[PDB]
Amino acid sequence: SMEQVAMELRLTELTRLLRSVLDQLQDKDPARIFAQPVSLKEVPDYLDHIKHPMDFATMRKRLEAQGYKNLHEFEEDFDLIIDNCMKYNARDTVFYRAAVRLRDQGGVVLRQARREVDSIG
Numbered sequence: 001s002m003e004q005v006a007m008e009l010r011l012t013e014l015t016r017l018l019r020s021v022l023d024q025l026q027d028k029d030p031a032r033i034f035a036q037p038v039s040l041k042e043v044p045d046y047l048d049h050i051k052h053p054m055d056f057a058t059m060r061k062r063l064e065a066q067g068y069k070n071l072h073e074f075e076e077d078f079d080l081i082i083d084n085c086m087k088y089n090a091r092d093t094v095f096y097r098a099a100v101r102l103r104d105q106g107g108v109v110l111r112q113a114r115r116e117v118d119s120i121g
Contacts, residue, residue: 010121011066011069012066013120014071014117015063015066015068017113017116017117017120018063018068018071018074019063021074021109022059022060022074025078025106025109025110026056028101028102029056029098029102031094031098033094033098033099034055034056034081034085034098034102035055035056036055036056037053037055037057037058038050038055046088049087049088050084050087050088052084053080054077054078054080054081054084058077059074059077059081062077070117071113071114078106078110081102082099082103085098085099086099
């Protein structure tokens with residue numbers, strides 16, 4: 001149907017916008033702390049602590065398969081990155097502090113993404 005195509009175009013355009021958002025957020029992580037999944041070879045107990053691991057590479061895979069239907073889903077995954085790190089790591093660590101800085105900087109980006117998603121439809 002043409003209605004199905006139109007819905008597919010909207011998903012494609014959301015994907016474009018989420019790719020730009022993802023780039024901007026990942027620039028706020030210049031140490032690349034959140035770039036890849038926590039390795040279970042290097043942190044063998046991780047999944048005893050963190051039930052839903054997340055990282056920027058994993059989000060990029062989901063994005064490129066057009067797997068985010070709305071901004072809320074994307075933000076959920078971004079918040080997992082931050083929130084998982086702030087639980088596993090203590091306050092005095094470079095990991096925790098990186099997460100705080102990513103959250104604070106990323107909020108600015110997400111605030112305008114939400115306006116754009118709503119505005120363009």
